[PDB]
Design a protein around this ligand. Structure first.
Ligand code: HEM
Ligand SMILES: CCCCCCCCCCCCCC(=O)O
Length: 417
C-alpha cells in the first residue's frame, strides 16, 4: 500500500522541548497530533516517538528494533555502563539476561526481603533518636546497605556512604545537564574501578562471596563461548544490580507521599489482607513518574499504521504516557489502587518496561522492586509512626527522575513495639 507521512514536529532540534516538558513531552504530542506516533528531531538527529499498547508490542519486536548503539553516549556514561546487558541484542543478549534472571529465584528473593526488613529496622532505630529525617536520602542508604548485603559485596562504613552518594549520582545525572551531569560520570568511573578490583579479588581467591549472590554469579559467569566476562563488563553488570536497588528510594518517596495524600487508601491497608497492599504498590508504580521512555534503533525498514520506519532511526517508547493512556485506563490521572482489583497486559502497564523478561529488555529487577516496595509500605504503615511537617512536596514533571522538592521530611519517628 501507499506510504503516508508521519506527523512531524518542525524545528532544527527539539531536545529543548523534551528538557522543558520531561515526562509529558511524548504524551502531549500524541494528544496534539492526534496520533500514537510522531517524528521529531532530538540530540541532533531524526527521532520517532510512540506510545500505547500496540506501539509497545511493536517496539519489543526484536526483528524490528535493536539496542546496539541506541542509547546516547551521555546515558551510557551515567546510567548504563559500557557493554552491559542494555547494549546487547540477539542470542548474546539472551544469554547475558539469563545471568541476571538467575539471581531472581524464590529463595534469593526471600533473602532480599529479610535483609530489607532488617535494614528498615536499623534505620528506624536511628531516626527515633533524630529530630528531622530526610526520607529520600535515608532511603537511599537503606537500599545501598540492602543491595551490598544481598549482592555479597563487602563494604566498610565509609564505603557505604560513598557508594550511596555515587550510585545515587549515576541515575540522578542521566537526564541532567552541565555540572550535575558530570557528577554522575565521575561517580560511575570511581565505582567501576572499585568493583573491578573486587571482582579481580574474587577471581584470585582472596574474596569468597556466597554461591548464591550477585558477586559470585557475575564474577564466574561464562559467555556463549565458555569464557569469563571481561572484568570491566562484569563490573558494569554488578553495578546494574547495586545502582537500581538504590534507585528504589525514588519509589519509597512516592509511597510516603501517597500515604500522606490519600488517607482513605491508607485505611484500606489496615486489615492485613495482602490484596490491598499489592494493589497500592502497583498503583504507585503506575501513577508516579520514574523511567520516562526507552530507546532503540530501527533494525530494518518496515511499515506500521501506513508509515515507514527507516533502518537506523532512533525510536522512543513512551512509558509514562502508556501508564497514563486514557485509551487503556479509566481516569488515568488519579491515584486509585482499586483499578488493580484482580488485575491489562504486559504491553499496557510498563513502568519497568514491557514484554518478556527473557526475550527482551524488560527490567530484570521488577520482582525485586515490588518486593522491596511491599516491605517499605509495611514499615511505614505498621511498624512505625511519624509526622509529616508542612513542606513543599510538589514534584516537577520536567525533572527526571522527579523528587518531591523537600526530599520528604519526616519527624517524631517512633518504632512500634
Ligand atoms: C527502582 C526502580 C526501577 C525502575 C523504574 C526500573 C525500570 C527499568 C526499565 C524501564 C528498564 C528498561 C526496559 C527496556 O529497555 O526495555 C529497566 C531495565 C533493567 N533493570 Fe530496572 N528498574 C528499576 C529497578 C531495578 C532493580 C531493583 C534492578 C536489579 C535488581 C534492575 C535491573 C535492571 C536491569 C539489569 C535492566 C536491563 C535489562 C535488559 O536490558 O535486558 N532494575 N529497568
Ligand atoms: C534512556 C532514557 C534515560 C531517562 C533518564 C533517567 C531518569 C530515570 C532514572 C531511572 C533509574 C531506573 C533504575 C536504574 O537503571 O538505575
Amino acid at each position: 500500500s501507499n506510504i503516508n507521512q508521519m506527523p512531524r514536529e518542525e524545528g532544527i532540534d527539539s531536545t529543548w522541548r523534551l528538557m522543558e516538558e520531561g515526562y509529558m513531552y511524548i504524551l502531549n504530542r500524541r494528544h496534539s497530533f492526534n496520533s500514537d506516533i510522531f517524528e521529531t528531531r532530538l540530540l541532533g538527529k531524526k527521532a520517532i516517538c510512540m506510545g500505547g499498547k500496540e506501539a509497545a508490542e511493536i517496539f519489543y519486536d526484536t526483528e524490528k528494533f535493536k539496542r546496539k548503539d541506541a542509547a546516547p553516549n551521555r546515558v551510557v556514561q551515567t546510567l548504563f555502563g559500557k557493554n552491559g546487558v542494555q547494549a546487547l541484542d540477539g542470542q548474546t543478549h539472551k544469554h547475558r539476561k539469563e545471568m541476571f534472571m538467575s539471581i531472581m529465584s524464590p529463595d534469593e528473593l526471600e533473602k532480599l526481603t529479610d535483609i530489607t526488613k532488617k535494614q528498615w529496622e536499623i534505620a528506624v532505630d536511628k531516626w527515633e533518636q533524630m529530630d528531622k529525617v530526610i526520607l529520600y536520602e535515608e532511603a537511599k542508604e537503606i537500599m545501598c546497605r540492602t543491595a551490598c548485603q544481598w549482592a555479597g559485596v563487602p563494604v566498610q562504613e565509609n564505603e557505604v556512604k560513598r557508594l550511596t552518594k555515587n550510585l545515587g549520582a549515576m541515575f540522578e545525572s542521566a537526564a541532567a545537564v552541565g555540572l550535575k551531569h558530570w557528577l554522575g560520570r565521575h561517580a560511575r568511573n570511581y565505582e567501576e574501578i572499585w568493583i573491578e578490583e573486587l571482582i579481580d579479588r574474587v577471581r584470585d581467591g582472596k574474596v569468597n562471596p556466597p554461591e548464591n549472590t550477585t558477586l559470585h554469579k557475575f564474577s564466574w559467569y561464562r559467555d556463549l563461548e565458555g569464557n569469563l566476562l571481561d572484568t570491566e563488563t562484569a563490573a558494569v553488570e554488578v553495578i546494574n544490580i547495586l545502582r537500581p536497588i538504590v534507585a528504589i528510594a525514588i519509589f519509597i518517596n512516592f509511597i510516603a507521599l501517597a500515604l500522606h495524600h490519600y488517607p482513605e487508601e491508607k485505611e484500606k491497608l489496615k486489615s492485613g489482607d495482602k490484596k490491598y497492599s499489592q494493589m497500592f504498590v502497583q498503583e504507585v508504580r503506575r501513577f508516579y513518574p520514574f523511567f520516562p521512555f526507552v530507546v532503540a534503533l530501527v533494525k530494518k525498514d518496515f511499515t506500521w499504521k501506513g508509515y515507514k520506519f527507516e533502518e537506523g532511526t532512533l525510536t522512543l517508547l513512551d512509558l509514562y504516557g502508556t501508564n497514563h493512556d486514557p485509551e487503556i485506563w479509566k481516569n488515568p490521572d488519579v491515584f486509585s489502587p482499586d483499578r488493580f482489583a484482580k488485575w491489562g497486559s504486559p504491553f499496557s502497564f510498563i513502568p519497568q518496561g514491557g514484554g518478556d523478561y527473557f526475550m527482551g529488555h524488560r527490567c530484570a529487577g521488577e520482582w525485586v522492586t515490588i518486593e522491596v516496595m511491599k516491605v517499605s509500605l509495611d514499615y511505614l504503615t505498621n511498624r512505625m509512626d511519624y509526622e509529616v511537617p508542612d513542606q513543599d512536596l510538589s514534584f516537577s514533571m520536567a525533572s527526571m527522575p522527579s523528587i518531591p522538592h523537600s526530599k520528604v521530611v519526616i519527624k517524631n519517628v517512633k518504632k512500634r513495639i
